[PDB]
């Protein structure tokens, strides 16, 4: 199966909630597309690194260890998932 048009799954109220956690009061109308683009870029980088890591191991399932290891490689260490 082929997946298409899922970046629209990040609804505007979800972005509003994420912003409200950050302590903002007013959000302009053009923020949402920029936020979606930034999220897409970040996910692309992390997922590419994870896919390379799981490819070297000759496996077909992406483990949580690959994800935390890629995040560490990118300079964003994550705690609470076994590493």
């Amino acid at each position: 199966k082929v997946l298409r048009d899922n970046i629209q799954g990040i609804t505007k109220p979800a972005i509003r909630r994420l912003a409200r956690r950050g302590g903002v009061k007013r959000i302009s109308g053009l923020i949402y597309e920029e936020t979606r683009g930034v999220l897409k870029v970040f996910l692309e980088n992390v997922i590419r690194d994870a896919v390379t890591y799981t490819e070297h191991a000759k496996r077909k399932t992406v483990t949580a260890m690959d994800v935390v290891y890629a995040l560490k490689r990118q300079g964003r260490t994550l705690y609470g998932f076994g590493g």
Partner: protein, 108 residues
């Protein structure tokens, strides 16, 4: 053959000296490992863990709770200067953020 005593008991520690020694020797760090390195490393790790746990427990007591949850750890780490500097680039799952609102946003 005398009765065995663990090296942690000899050094008066709680962390495992033998396990740390084995991890150092199998960790591809050096060809040889001295006798006093695992004791030092275990002592440092125990001190750091004790400090963090004390701060988290104080926060949990302040929040009128008995058990410690990741939110308390996040508060304790983020409210201390040295710990914040040490763990500046670390994300804690289910940690949340510190309550902070800019003064300008607050209404008159």
């Amino acid at each position: 053959r005398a009765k065995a005593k663990t090296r942690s008991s000899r050094a008066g520690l709680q962390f495992p000296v033998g396990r740390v020694h084995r991890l150092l020797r199998k960790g591809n760090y050096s060809e040889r490992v001295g006798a006093g390195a695992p004791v030092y490393l275990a002592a440092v790790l125990e001190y750091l863990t004790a400090e963090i746990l004390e701060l988290a427990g104080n926060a949990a007591r302040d929040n009128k709770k008995t058990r410690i949850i990741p939110r308390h750890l996040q508060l304790a780490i983020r409210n201390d200067e040295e710990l914040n500097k040490l763990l500046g680039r670390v994300t804690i799952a289910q940690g949340g953020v510190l309550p902070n609102i800019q003064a300008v946003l607050l209404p008159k």
